[PDB]
Symmetry: C3
Subunit: 441 residues, 3 copies
């Protein structure tokens, strides 16, 4: 890059030089079509069924879409036996009583179990008919939420576009990175009917290009959105341009001032020079400039003599006139001009505000480093941008904080494999009891 | 649809004709007020209670709002015998019964334990699982609430953003600021003719681009803003667009470019001129301009298309001493001023060159011409089609799987444990009867 | 305040007066840097694991970031009776034994089944409970990422939509807090600071935000604020309408429209003129213009409001040979040039016609005039109010219902099953005593 400004004291004007043209002469259409990723909604019952996220998101969406659509148009021995009989009488009689006691013991236990059973049913029944429904009710609601999120996630680009269009009545400048991806833009450029350097220029300058392009909504249907992107095409590259700035000029033997009217970008076209009257039409990036033919004015290279002379055969030369002294200042790409006339005081101050130059009732130029500020009378002009105060906004990190539920399975299964100890034990006791009795007859 | 261009070789200029005016002369105010749908947050305990969605969403929101706020300012046969055989018998029974007793002990301890355990099962449920089920139940209620807040408050939120990004004023009036339904009935209410209304209705897009929305007042639960719509003081006047290219001469050394380009368009007996694009937009043969900065001029302006020099109108122009060659693209073709040493070329659709340029100033049109080149600069008379780009989507899966319990088969086992108890009791029943027969 | 318009009949032009300047002459850079609040994702298994919200959101985000990055470059004896007795007892005991068998098998089953209940819980339900517990952790994490990273996200978008540079500096790029203190740090006078502070809106509209550098976890951009090198000078707005009543020095007719409309406004002993709206914005009696393309002119310009022709200033004008009639709306009323055959009308609030126009050039004002018509074109001097639109919202329901367990009533049953065992053991206890008394 080799940008320079050269100041023309005799015309109180300054030109910035060393820029390279790129001039729109046309447009490249392209038709981008986007499928929605649709949800098929799963009619279950969630926790609270006035809540219907999926239904609702769809409506929200569908509606946006309609909105846009609208834009388009006993008896006892005796003697003996004696005592013995009655020993057995006594023994038997104990046993009877002991057995009755046992019976009532088994009744107790039976009723115990009858109840523990009665209760285990209820435990099951809580689970099956109380908890379990609202577990897998949640399971549903979650499936919904997930679905919704994932709809916005995967349909992101479409949605972004949809908004963009809603907010712009279906037409945008800058072609957002949602309308066109870099990858896309880049290959799209590739496909343009232009020279190879041209392609490379465009590729190394996506920002400008986007700023220079439009996106027009084409057609919206619930499940497809298509729009036309509109890119610039340059009919010339690499011709030199220059920016002209202009400040009033007065004699001193008083009486007359001149300000040259025609400021802006000049920039060579086919053997002739194209002039673009207002910022608007041009953007610039380093030593690269990009302007739009559309409204340009075509003029002869003889325009240039106006930087030196004004009055000179060859070009009448747009100007404005004053009878009275006017003083002021004009900031350029690479310094500033200052026209200090009549009674007015002018000052160039440096980086730290120390005053370096002071102004001899005429028209001078200064530049960055050296000059940071000029004042004319009470107005202050800043030759450089004033740096100040960074602001900083910190973030912490965010916590996926989950804690599983876990069951004593093993220790429990122990207890049980051990209740079976007892039954297994019990049965074997009876087994033994019965043997003894099938030995009685 | 009768748009045309007629080229004026003697003024190296072209006019696009057959357009119909609509010219802004005023504004139509309307005050749109929007209620927020507020959440009443339900202080439960969610799964992890550093997480506080509803509280948090509300703050986000509330804050946006503050921000905007700030923008505003039999008895026999020796029997002794039997006795002793009964004595051994008794003695067996004793032992047998003890064995049974120990059996009932075992079972009792079995149950004592199975009981001890069923309690624990219940207790896991009640005091372990059940909290964190209906903790989840809470967090979900929240999430749902949040989502549904964004859903139902959508339009408001969209607006709120729009305003934050635009410091409280927008052009295009979005479909979020104004619905078609709304815009339409609003138009209906405007103090204009009926055709006028119909024009507006059949052109919403332009209208919206021509309208503003200004934020009026924001309160946590209400937002109100003023929409600002255009009003046309005239419809259906012809307009035309003028394009203009340099014109040089021979017998020696003057070049003319007509300065005054843009839209002309008839007003009350006189003609309104709008200097820059900006002011005008156009849809088919319909044009919409803004008086605001217009210049009013006499019909006599028209003779300038033919003559330039002529009594009646001094005529805006710029001057060159030296030959200047170039090209200018029109609505419906192109102009090309080929002068001095420069070479000029019109090529067709496929780039086959059709015309080559006789050192003057000519016009060409679409079909026929696709491209003109002046020296090394290339101009495109038509937009170049290229490469559709396509971006596919699949469809997305609501993927839920219920949990279900063997209820019947379980209830079977149980209604069947009761088999055994019912059975057991009856066995004892029988035993007892036999004993109340012993005395 | 004190805004006024004074109309100059002899120049068919009107000036609005009493505004106070503020004029851009520099910029103030500041570099804002924003940390992302990052998620450390928790690789669990959720309900359906094709779903991966956190992974997915991050990708969405990370991608936006890459995109932006790319922008940058007879009956019975005893004994016989005892005999029979024993024999009864045997049978009765057998019956008891089979009773204990029944109960044993009953328990054997109830046990068999309680295991299954546990196992459903442990191996069926419990996994999918704390699968949901995971999925929720995720959803929450996602939401909370958008919530806490809100500002950054809003910015990221804004930049994506504008190819990395915006005007209005949104409240998301700069908070009022920030803007305010930023202003405070600017190298300007105190009144100046106060001005800016009482006018945030304009300031914002006058500022730019340029994206500076993007990394996955930090975004930094430069805000660019205006600096005025003069405040509190008077400015005035000039409006201009055609004039057919005129003459110079033996020069009969000619119709004149004064070219140089827009904002004038005093600078260092000279006057700065800003040719198009664009450059200037205004809030009450406060005006804000941009030096950048201004034209510096002598106070003598003002005589042009009175004379046009006068030594001292040649005076930008345009010319017509022919009568041109029209109307021009001003800040505080309207001008109307009614010439030749044309009919002109001022109507009030309700459309009752007040004035009718004597073939010259007049001014009117708000209250009094609401409408002027020139021929068929209608101009609106005031904005037409109409129809408020209203959009209601209800409030939204956090609707949660806890699950609760009969714990007490259950524990009652069980503390009561132990009644029975406790009872049963005691019955055996008593049985055994009786038997260790047999020998
Ligand atoms: C969940 O979805 C259905 C449909 O709503 C549920 O049915 C509801 O409740 C009972 C049936 O258990 C019915 O009397 C009603 O028809 C439903 N309620 C209403 C208000 O209509 C059912 O519980 C679940 N569905 C399935 C397929 O098992
Ligand atoms: C209770 O005892 C029974 C019967 O004696 C067990 O069943 C058998 O026992 C052993 C395992 O302890 C195996 O070798 C056999 O193959 C089993 N066969 C069948 C067909 O069941 C029973 O497993 C025991 N249970 C407990 C918990 O002690
Ligand atoms: C177990 O036994 C109980 C009580 O003895 C049964 O209750 C029966 O209920 C009906 C009700 O109409 C009565 O007519 C009978 O008197 C009862 N039956 C008997 C045999 O006494 C109960 O149905 C039985 N339950 C199970 C699960 O087997
Ligand atoms: C069932 O039996 C046990 C043991 O006899 C009871 O526990 C005892 O209760 C008393 C108080 O009443 C305490 O002083 C003892 O220290 C306990 N001892 C043991 C070994 O447990 C038990 O509480 C009884 N109650 C129920 C409701 O089952
Ligand atoms: C769930 O948790 C809340 C608060 O987090 C509970 O409030 C508790 O109240 C006691 C006093 O009774 C406090 O000392 C504790 O700070 C709270 N407990 C815990 C575990 O944090 C309340 O029990 C529940 N609240 C709701 C709304 O359901
Ligand atoms: C949940 O499921 C994962 C997903 O596979 C689990 O990985 C387990 O471990 C083995 C390897 O040792 C895998 O092949 C199995 O799929 C899983 N088996 C079991 C018994 O859990 C893992 O435990 C969980 N999550 C993560 C992120 O690892
Ligand atoms: C750009 O700078 C060079 C480098 O020395 C200088 O010689 C020249 O004057 C500049 N460019 C042009 C086009 O004159």
């Amino acid at each position: 890059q080799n940008i320079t400004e050269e100041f023309y004291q005799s015309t109180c004007s300054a030109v910035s030089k060393g820029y390279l043209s790129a001039l729109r002469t046309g447009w490249y259409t392209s038709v981008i079509t986007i499928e929605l990723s649709n949800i098929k909604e799963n009619k279950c019952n969630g926790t609270d069924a006035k809540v219907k996220l999926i239904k609702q998101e769809l409506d929200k969406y569908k509606n946006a879409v309609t909105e846009l659509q609208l834009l388009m148009q006993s008896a006892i021995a005796s003697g003996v036996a004696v005592s013995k009989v009655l020993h057995l009488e006594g023994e038997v009689n104990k046993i009877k009583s002991a057995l009755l006691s046992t019976n009532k013991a088994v009744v107790s236990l039976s009723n115990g179990v009858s109840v523990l059973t009665s209760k285990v049913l209820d435990l099951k029944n809580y689970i099956d008919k109380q908890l379990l429904p609202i577990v897998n009710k949640q399971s549903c609601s979650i499936s919904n939420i997930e679905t919704v999120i994932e709809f916005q996630q995967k349909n992101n680009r479409l949605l972004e576009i949809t908004r963009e269009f809603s907010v712009n009545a279906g037409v945008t400048t800058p072609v957002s990175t949602y309308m066109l991806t870099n990858s896309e833009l880049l290959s799209l450029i590739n496909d343009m009917p232009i020279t190879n350097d041209q392609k490379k220029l465009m590729s190394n300058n996506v920002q400008i290009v986007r700023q220079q392009s439009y996106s027009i909504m084409s057609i919206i249907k619930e499940e497809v959105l298509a729009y036309v992107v509109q890119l610039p095409l340059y009919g010339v590259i690499d011709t030199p341009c220059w920016k002209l700035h202009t400040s009033p000029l007065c004699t001193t033997n008083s009486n007359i001032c001149l300000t040259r009217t025609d400021r802006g970008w000049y920039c060579d076209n086919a053997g002739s020079v194209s002039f673009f009257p207002q910022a608007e039409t041009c953007k610039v990036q380093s030593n690269r400039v990009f302007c739009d033919t559309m409204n340009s004015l075509t003029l002869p290279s003889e325009v240039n003599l106006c930087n030196v002379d004004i009055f000179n055969p060859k070009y009448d030369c747009k100007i404005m006139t004053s009878k009275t002294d006017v003083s002021s200042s004009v900031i350029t790409s690479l310094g500033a001009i200052v026209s200090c006339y009549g009674k007015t005081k002018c000052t160039a101050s440096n980086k730290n505000r120390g005053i370096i130059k002071t102004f001899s009732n005429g028209c001078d130029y200064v530049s960055n480093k050296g000059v940071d500020t000029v004042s004319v009378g009470n107005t202050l002009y800043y030759v450089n941008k004033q740096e100040g105060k960074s602001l900083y906004v910190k973030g912490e990190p965010i916590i996926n904080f989950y804690d599983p539920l876990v069951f004593p399975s093993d220790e429990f299964d122990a207890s049980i494999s051990q209740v079976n100890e007892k039954i297994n034990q019990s049965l074997a006791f009876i087994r033994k009891s019965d043997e003894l009795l099938h030995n009685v007859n």
